[PDB]
Amino acid sequence: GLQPAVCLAIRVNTFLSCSQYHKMYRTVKAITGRQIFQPLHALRNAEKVLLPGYHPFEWQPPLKNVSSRTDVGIIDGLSGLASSVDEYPVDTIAKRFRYDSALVSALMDMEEDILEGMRSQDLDDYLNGPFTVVVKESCDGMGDVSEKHGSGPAVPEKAVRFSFTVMRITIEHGSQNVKVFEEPKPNSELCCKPLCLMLADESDHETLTAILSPLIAEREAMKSSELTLEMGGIPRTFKFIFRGTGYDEKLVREVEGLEASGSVYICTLCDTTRLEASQNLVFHSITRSHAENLQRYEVWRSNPYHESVEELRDRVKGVSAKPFIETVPSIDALHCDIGNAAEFYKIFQLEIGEVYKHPNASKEERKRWQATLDKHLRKRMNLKPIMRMNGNFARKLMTQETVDAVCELIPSEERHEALRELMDLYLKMKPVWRSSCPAKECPESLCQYSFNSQRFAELLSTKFKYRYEGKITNYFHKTLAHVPEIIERDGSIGAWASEGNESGNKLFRRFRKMNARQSKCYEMEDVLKHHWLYTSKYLQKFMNAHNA
Amino acid sequence: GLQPAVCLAIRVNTFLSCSQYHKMYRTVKAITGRQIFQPLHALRNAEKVLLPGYHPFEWQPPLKNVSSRTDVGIIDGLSGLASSVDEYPVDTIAKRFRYDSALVSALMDMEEDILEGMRSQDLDDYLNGPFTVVVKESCDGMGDVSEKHGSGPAVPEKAVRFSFTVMRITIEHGSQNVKVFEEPKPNSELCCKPLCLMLADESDHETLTAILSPLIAEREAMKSSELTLEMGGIPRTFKFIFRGTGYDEKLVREVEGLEASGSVYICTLCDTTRLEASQNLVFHSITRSHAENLQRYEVWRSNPYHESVEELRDRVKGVSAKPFIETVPSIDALHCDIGNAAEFYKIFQLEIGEVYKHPNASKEERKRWQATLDKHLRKRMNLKPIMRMNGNFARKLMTQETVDAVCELIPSEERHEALRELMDLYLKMKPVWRSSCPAKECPESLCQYSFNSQRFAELLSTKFKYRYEGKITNYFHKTLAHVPEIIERDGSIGAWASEGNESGNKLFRRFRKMNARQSKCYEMEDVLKHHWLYTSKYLQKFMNAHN
Amino acid sequence: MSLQMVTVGHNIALIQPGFSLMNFDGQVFFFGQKGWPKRSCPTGVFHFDIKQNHLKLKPAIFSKDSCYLPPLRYPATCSYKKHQYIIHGGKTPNNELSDKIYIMSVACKNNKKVTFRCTEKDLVGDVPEPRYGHSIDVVYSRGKSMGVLFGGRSYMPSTQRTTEKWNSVADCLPHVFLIDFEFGCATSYILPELQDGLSFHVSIARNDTVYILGGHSLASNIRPANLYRIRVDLPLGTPAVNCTVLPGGISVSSAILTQTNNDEFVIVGGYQLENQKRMVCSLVSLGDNTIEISEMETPDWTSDIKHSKIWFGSNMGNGTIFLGIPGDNKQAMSEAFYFYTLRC
Amino acid sequence: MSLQMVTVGHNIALIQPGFSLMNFDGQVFFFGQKGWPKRSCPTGVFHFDIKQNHLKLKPAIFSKDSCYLPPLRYPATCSYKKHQYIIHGGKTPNNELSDKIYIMSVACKNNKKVTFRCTEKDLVGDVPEPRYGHSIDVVYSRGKSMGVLFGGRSYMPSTQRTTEKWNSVADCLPHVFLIDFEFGCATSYILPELQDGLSFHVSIARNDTVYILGGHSLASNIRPANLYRIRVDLPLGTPAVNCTVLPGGISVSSAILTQTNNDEFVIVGGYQLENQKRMVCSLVSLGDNTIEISEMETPDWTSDIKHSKIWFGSNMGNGTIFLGIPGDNKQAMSEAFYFYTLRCS
DNA sequence: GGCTGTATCACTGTG
DNA sequence: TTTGCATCACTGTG
DNA sequence: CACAGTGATACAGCC
DNA sequence: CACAGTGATGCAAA
Ligand SMILES: [Ca+2]
Ligand SMILES: [Ca+2]
Ligand SMILES: [Zn+2]
Ligand SMILES: [Zn+2]
């Protein structure tokens, strides 16, 4: 005999579809003669407890503009958007949970973990003290999502996903707050719970705003409120702190009202021009926020001081749009690594062509330089050339062996020394904005970070001025300037990266292909439900039943 | 407690990987206390029997240039190709089974099927008479296969697959041949047993020949021989008939010595030219053959009659290369449908803009016509635009509802009847070359096929003259000329189609990323072994244990 | 009426349904782009130039006293007489309505370069709620000018708005608003002759009357064929407003209105049912007191226009309509519409 | 020695390792393309025109008496003095060796338009087995001309070939073959000095001697540094062949040989070990009886040439070597090789 | 002695 | 009450 | 310092 | 006339 919950856990964790599981169950029953696996209807009955809209809960004070019903599941992401022929065209299929139901479902899944942490922290396991749940929000935009035939809108070939992850829960027990749950693998796809799936372009601001306005409305509603929920007997109270740091640079620019990527104003944390960043390179402070962006947009619209276009753009630094999502200013570790890799790749191409003494080169010779670099990299580091830049290429490129292999193509030796020093400094600085707990994992590296940043900036301005003189890269600026301050503010950079959402995109593609109905009006619902079930600690605990 | 064979069948046919199966097995054992499933090493031991290289067999007379050993499994597809720096560069990874060993394994996996078939026709189960089997061969060239990192040759981003399927087996009892096995789903991916997997470009003749020469040598050895095997405790004797039919037009042209792509000579079955086909359209006979192509190439190389280039090309009828694979002259039932759909799509585009009345038009106007057709097709037939035509789009496009939907974009009413007549004739002709047994599935359609072909050609020459005067398409020529004769020769067109190999390409793509080691030195052999297991009737029989 | 195909340059992506076109002394300008203004054109106002059946959109700069308005997607626009434009309502790219009146004028004009002045005027009194799809016209009586504003769509009030139906819309009340631009005041009037709200209607401004024809009511999901005449009298005392329902209206939603000659107008396009598109044109002639509408010749629409599900357009102010049609080819392509020009 | 890049037109893909170049009265022609001949150029021979450091390949037509030869991939080619070319062996695109002798000559050239004549010469007697990578030269003595053919690399015999090792190769016997082209006869001679087979070697043709230097023996997987002189005498009776081993040889496999002046040759390219590539150049000075091998200046190789794993090339007949290195990048790209012209004074 | 569990190897994919 | 199987508009490899 | 596979092989541990 | 899914729903059978 085997329980329906365990059968469901096996099915959802070993990438099994309902049809394949039906085949397995039928064959096992026919041969053994005894019903070992539970049938499909039993599994789908057992899956209702895990999904949202099952457990009662209360909000005090009640959420503004949010329904008080506690039995809402998968709802339309358009949120009543008008589809009449007279109004603006709508070509988008969106499905979402409710933000106040997804949270209670996640907490009820983590009930056992919360109780275990309470017991292991020497606290009594009946306290109803107000917990503080920190939740990290990620929004990602996938391309090359093929559309389907059939009735429905002319939906584009792109998708947008909005997800959240519970990071930390703390309880106040006197003069100090003590932890009862900390996520061990924050960047894993196992803990990244989907909240909204839509098929629309990331650059389509009207559609993106129309779909994501209800979610932001709910989130702002439950910032000042307390949630009462019965968790294993006693009812307990929860608060929430939302930290949206899983966004990429382009999406932060779009949703915080800042201008497009190519502009004089480069950093999304401070307000410094590219030339000023190239001249300073080290000393900057974080002076940007959602409220400041709103005020600056108001200044831009009103033009109270009667300034020309250029003077107004200087006054309101890059805020030519009105923000609509509050994001914490931080650095995405994955994209920072990729950008640094691309910059170093271009540095190698320039160095194997001796641009430091030949300022001008033909367009047909830089291609030859790139071809030589690609051939030698394949020969030595076993890396094939790729079109864009991904993380694995960055990890295999930012090693010292790559520099040693590349130096065979550089005629000079002082260039060898300069490039080796640059790579050593970069590798010394990297584990600070990539580890999950720098104070307990790389303390010497964290302490010796300002010195290494200054040395890196000096080397960049002295021995690489042919590319960095009046122009610096956004990621280089962020890495050299804001990393110690962000570490001091938060605790870790890298535990708040977009890695979880990027990993979940793979699950999204796999589920849309072989775990969801192929109709145009059910695929998003099926994918959302299956993804939520996959990211469930109650089910994942059974797969670790061998060791206990 | 299940048996290792049953557990292996469940794992293979439920698309489970070894890691996922280990997770399932561990959880079930831990939570039930009893070993319901079986461990990975048990499954791996059980999978030896179902692979080539286990069963003993004999050949009489012994195959020429083929080793007599009966314990060969996955072997290198390069076949000792020189990888030295002085020789021609080698940049491919290939793995293959020996053809004889693979066929022995395939026959042994359907032992119960053969015995049941011979019991079902009042024949003794212990007969050892010569079983004549017929095998269908397919070769397909995939694209957009991403290359992996790591040490190894700079392999290209394309793959080539070779596969065979056992179609039928007959035994001579008295004065007639009785069938003991006939495959019920010939185009399915469940019977498309792989034989050779290589990462090479289809239009790379040097590499393709260097890797597929040993297989053709083994096949030529097997043509004149007789296999002795053991089934049910009795020795049985087998003979083989190979038929290569899964090839597409491009591959058969490249491999049969014919000139590539478009030319004066359009058909791979007869020697007609494009102008002659556009003038006759109905009356032709099959003449091409492998031996004929070899003779034509010899004439081309030797130039016996001292002719110029043009006269020599006319004499040799487009054979400018030496063939190296024997393929029967036949028409694929999938690419023919796709090509006909593309031709009808272009016809619709032209008819929207009234090219019969206006001989000339601009590129912008043609693009606008295509945009109008695409929008209306999405509105009515729920078809999105696609870059290249595929089978589902062809099937939905070749309905009369599509012609009715396009009818309201054509202004002239006289064109509506012509287009509807064309589509009706096409739909009356299609099942003849699409069915798996036309005599017993569409007898009337088979009987009145010449009349429909003549009417279709008359319509093309009269109404749609603006596009088919002096130029007709290869698939139109084939469907209007050769199908009444190919069916009389073989028995069906749809059964011998590349559908099985095309469906198996999907399995190849799935396996390369979910059931194979992610290294350039192991992925091909892993995929080959897993595919061979997936196409095993012994394993597939377990899943149908409820019924 | 002649139909011609207009090719558009490198900023096609800036044209979206619900844009507004303005006419200043024979020069055509464009407002209401898709997305927030970029660095190339911070103002968002372009110079709509059509020559040899080709369309170009070049940027236009505002003045130092100006206010940089958001791209409004369905505003209410009227001409006020130097010649200035009044835009009220609309929908910003963040999908939130606006309740601000913006006045556009021409500050300095150079050789093929025009500088605008956009002044924001704040209303006081019984201010209309934020809305889109409404209509605003200007009435002159006894030497004094005022503005008449009618109803449209709006989101639910903040006390009855739920996230699950966040984007739902309802027709505003059928109240008639009189707006004094000189002092920036507004007064609301309830007329018993108007009982159902209207959106996406057509308004024609005579000297002291406003004719409201066409529309769509969400309460009953019908397109009534009703014509209303609103007369405003402005004596030394309080203003007076009267409404009269006249026979002879037409059922059309989101029509395009143009002025061919004096005391003559042309209504082209719109919608009759959800899946039925109004392919006939109407001619409206106004007299001292009585007006009459009639059916004129149907222009030779092309094959694509007839079978398009949706279509949008605007008026170019010289008896010409600029109207688009979706191409349904947005996948890996730059051309998403098939704009046409129609001459009356 | 000057090295200069050369760009190729739209038929770049036709160039593959193992091609051959022929010189006819100052014109350069190309043979041995990749894949079977297409409809644009049925013959397979092209006009290798290099002007202002740009390469174009225009089609060339054969004559009515010609034989349309297959594209051979590693043939043994020699000049014969009108001026004609002799091609023996090679590999067809189907990867099967050839045992035919083709004689190519020029039938008619009017103005930058040459028509060829290819005649297949039947070989009788002790006919050499099909092979590739061998060498053939022409010797003149007492007013009579013959050809000397040395061993190369072939497949296994038909009685010992297994499908599992179908493409395996073995060095042929070190026999020396004398070929008479006037009557089309062949005679095999066994020389005790030649004990191991050689493939991809260099042959210098003096008056009545053939110098064989360099090579690669597959039996031992070594590249011996041996020099052999084959002296052939043609009296009224049976011909006589002698072989002598001389000191001073060099170890090189698949070298490119060119002639600068009268009795002066230059050897460039080749391989010393598998992962080591011969980046030096040698100068061969011929004499009445003795020859001298010297080391000349190393050409200014570019970065991409030095680090390329493989390279190939041919002789353009006017003290110019046309060589090429792979470009690795071949996905969604048309340029797969980079080509250089090297001039020896 | 046979059966079973687990670590190791160079890689994947979502960016 | 609990199982089992057919139905619906679609997929992907071409 | 992403993380959960991808499978075959070899060695240690248990019945 | 490709074929084995893709899952939720509803009705028949036990
Ligand atoms: Ca992304
Ligand atoms: Ca194919
Ligand atoms: Zn900054
Ligand atoms: Zn034919």
Side-chain angles (χ1 to χ4, degrees), chain B residues 267 270 477 482:
Chain B
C267 192
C270 66
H477 169 85
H482 299 303

Side-chain angles (χ1 to χ4, degrees), chain B residues 367-368 371 375 379 409, chain C residues 5 304 307 327-328 335 340:
Chain B
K367 184 180 180 180
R368 185 59 63 95
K375 284 174 53 59
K379 276 189 54 184
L409 294 170
Chain C
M5 189 182 306
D304 52 358
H307 299 288
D328 293 333
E335 47 277 356
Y340 293 105

Side-chain angles (χ1 to χ4, degrees), chain B residues 87 91 209-210 218 301 322, chain D residues 120 132 153 163 167 330:
Chain B
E87 302 288 333
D91 53 355
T209 48
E218 296 177 24
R301 192 196 59 82
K322 185 174 181 300
Chain D
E120 171 183 345
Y132 73 89
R153 192 169 303 191
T163 173
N167 301 335
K330 61 179 61 181

Side-chain angles (χ1 to χ4, degrees), chain D residues 101-110 113-292:
Chain D
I101 286 188
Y102 299 104
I103 312 293
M104 269 194 176
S105 55
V106 170
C108 56
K109 46 179 300 180
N110 47 24
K113 196 62 182 58
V114 179
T115 76
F116 289 112
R117 172 195 317 271
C118 178
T119 302
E120 171 183 345
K121 197 68 185 178
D122 300 329
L123 225 49
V124 77
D126 199 327
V127 45
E129 61 177 350
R131 51 173 87 238
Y132 73 89
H134 51 295
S135 190
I136 181 173
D137 276 1
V138 188
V139 288
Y140 308 149
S141 62
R142 297 186 184 179
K144 306 179 179 61
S145 57
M146 282 198 78
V148 185
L149 196 152
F150 190 62
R153 192 169 303 191
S154 66
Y155 289 146
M156 303 285 178
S158 60
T159 61
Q160 296 178 5
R161 201 175 180 185
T162 65
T163 173
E164 302 181 1
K165 299 297 182 60
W166 195 250
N167 301 335
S168 65
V169 286
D171 291 333
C172 308
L173 299 175
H175 295 11
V176 168
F177 298 85
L178 284 186
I179 300 182
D180 181 12
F181 304 113
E182 300 292 338
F183 302 153
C185 75
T187 306
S188 62
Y189 293 133
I190 301 180
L191 304 174
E193 289 77 8
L194 300 163
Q195 299 290 342
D196 303 332
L198 284 186
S199 303
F200 308 106
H201 50 287
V202 177
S203 66
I204 297 273
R206 203 49 177 86
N207 293 17
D208 54 352
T209 52
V210 176
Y211 295 96
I212 297 183
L213 58 161
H216 178 274
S217 301
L218 199 144
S220 306
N221 193 14
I222 58 180
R223 294 179 172 85
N226 293 120
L227 186 146
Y228 304 98
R229 183 183 60 182
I230 302 177
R231 173 96 61 181
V232 37
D233 177 71
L234 302 179
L236 184 60
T238 302
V241 172
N242 299 270
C243 173
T244 309
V245 182
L246 290 78
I250 49 177
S251 67
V252 60
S253 178
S254 74
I256 322 175
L257 160 72
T258 161
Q259 176 170 359
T260 38
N261 202 19
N262 191 24
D263 301 329
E264 187 176 357
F265 299 86
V266 19
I267 296 170
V268 51
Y271 307 91
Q272 290 181 333
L273 285 315
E274 188 71 13
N275 57 90
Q276 211 286 337
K277 178 173 47 181
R278 180 177 173 94
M279 306 292 291
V280 312
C281 299
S282 297
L283 193 147
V284 188
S285 182
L286 278 288
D288 180 70
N289 183 31
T290 58
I291 77 176
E292 179 182 1

Side-chain angles (χ1 to χ4, degrees), chain B residues 64-67 72 75-89 91 96 98 154-158 203-207 209-211 213-215 217-218 254 259-264 297 300-303 305-309 311-313 320-324, chain D residues 16-18 33-40 42-43 61-70 73-74 91-96 100 102 120 132 153 155 157-169 199-200 216 218 223 253-254 271 273-274 309-310 328 330-332:
Chain B
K64 299 300 179 300
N65 300 326
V66 176
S67 178
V72 283
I75 60 180
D76 192 7
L78 302 175
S79 298
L81 191 56
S83 178
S84 181
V85 77
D86 307 330
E87 302 288 333
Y88 195 87
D91 53 355
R96 72 178 180 95
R98 252 174 58 190
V155 102
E157 294 187 356
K158 306 176 181 60
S203 62
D204 188 7
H205 217 190
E206 332 290 339
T207 295
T209 48
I211 291 187
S213 298
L215 286 181
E218 296 177 24
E254 183 179 7
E259 48 196 4
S261 181
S263 181
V264 191
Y297 168 71
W300 168 267
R301 192 196 59 82
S302 57
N303 198 19
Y305 301 96
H306 297 343
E307 303 184 350
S308 60
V309 195
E311 296 175 355
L312 188 51
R313 189 141 51 183
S320 175
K322 185 174 181 300
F324 72 102
Chain D
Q16 67 176 350
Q33 62 170 209
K34 178 179 187 56
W36 283 104
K38 303 299 181 59
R39 190 174 63 257
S40 58
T43 56
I61 56 180
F62 288 163
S63 63
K64 300 184 61 59
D65 310 329
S66 55
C67 299
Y68 291 77
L69 78 181
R73 226 188 309 175
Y74 281 99
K91 312 177 63 177
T92 68
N94 296 16
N95 289 80
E96 58 180 9
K100 303 288 183 183
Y102 299 104
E120 171 183 345
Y132 73 89
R153 192 169 303 191
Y155 289 146
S158 60
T159 61
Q160 296 178 5
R161 201 175 180 185
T162 65
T163 173
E164 302 181 1
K165 299 297 182 60
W166 195 250
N167 301 335
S168 65
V169 286
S199 303
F200 308 106
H216 178 274
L218 199 144
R223 294 179 172 85
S253 178
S254 74
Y271 307 91
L273 285 315
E274 188 71 13
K309 185 179 179 299
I310 77 181
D328 271 336
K330 61 179 61 181
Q331 32 87 26

Side-chain angles (χ1 to χ4, degrees), chain B residues 75 234 325 474:
Chain B
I75 60 180
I234 285 90
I325 293 188
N474 330 80

Side-chain angles (χ1 to χ4, degrees), chain A residues 65 78-79 85-88 91 98 204-206 209-210 218 262 301-303 306 308-309 321-322, chain C residues 16 34-36 39 64 68 93-96 120 132 153 158 161 163-164 166-167 216 253 271 274 330:
Chain A
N65 299 127
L78 301 177
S79 185
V85 81
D86 300 330
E87 306 201 21
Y88 194 82
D91 44 357
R98 230 174 63 188
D204 192 6
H205 208 178
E206 293 79 8
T209 44
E218 301 180 27
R301 190 195 59 80
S302 53
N303 196 338
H306 301 276
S308 178
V309 192
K322 186 176 183 301
Chain C
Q16 64 178 345
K34 179 181 187 58
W36 282 106
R39 190 175 64 258
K64 298 184 61 60
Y68 293 79
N94 301 126
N95 284 264
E96 57 181 5
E120 171 183 352
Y132 73 92
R153 311 276 176 88
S158 62
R161 197 144 177 237
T163 52
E164 305 180 2
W166 194 250
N167 302 341
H216 179 201
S253 177
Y271 300 92
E274 187 70 15
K330 59 183 59 182

